[PDB]
Amino acid sequence: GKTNYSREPANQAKAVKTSASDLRVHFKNTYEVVRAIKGLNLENAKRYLKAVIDRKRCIPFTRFTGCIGRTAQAHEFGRTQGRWPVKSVKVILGLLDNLSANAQAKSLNTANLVIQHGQVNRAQKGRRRTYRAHGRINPYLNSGCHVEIFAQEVAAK
């Protein structure tokens, strides 16, 4: 399980990398949480994810639209539909936390970390069964995650 991040940061003493692999969270959901985190401040990402968890804010749905509920919360976005994929958020959040603690040994400051490169990949699907009428059986699976995120320090003048 050695992570190869597809994209690399320009300054690696100035960067922080996290990845988790072969997760059990829903792909599409995770995908969109992440897609929503890109390009923010680590502190912001954390606040806003916590806020999604507390339901006071929505995680926009971008790529996977299939019949997703419209909320007023989607105003923040320009969107109609979004949700609160709690499990995904919690996992991602844990990843951000690994980012911050991952900055510790580097002696880097949190305030100026910015998130560039979230990557969510469809992992090997976990397999099981579903019994169907007439004695048919159909697949019942889960689509797992690979996630990686790196954070750059950018100084604000």
Added chain:
RNA sequence: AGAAAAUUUUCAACGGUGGAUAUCUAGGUUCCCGUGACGAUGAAGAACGCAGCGAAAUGCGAUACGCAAUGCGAAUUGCAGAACCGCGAGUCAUCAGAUCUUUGAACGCAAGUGGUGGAGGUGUAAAAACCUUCAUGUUUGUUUCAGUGUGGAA
């Protein structure tokens, strides 16, 4: 030029899915040559067992991954403990002597049963319990026999 994103889409790089391709092989396949060599002295097959730590596969049978003999002459090894430098190591080979549970042509009778007869041994005051033994056909004989079968002396 609703000249930003999202979606739809072309191309590349990297990553993910996936296991194609290439290169291998204690395998297969076919050809030629050599031996035919199982069994009531209980075969082929079946059951259950047997390692200090073992399920399988392979070996083995209460002497149970093995005894003996012989040849190699120092290992086994995943762990632990011993044994051995030749009084000889070994998961080595060879193999001509042994061990060979319950079965199965399967055999006292019977059987989805470790059930149950007779004879002998044992055990006991007498028992129980344990042990050995008994299938059918056939060729000779041995012994004991039957037949208003054929003969037949005193």
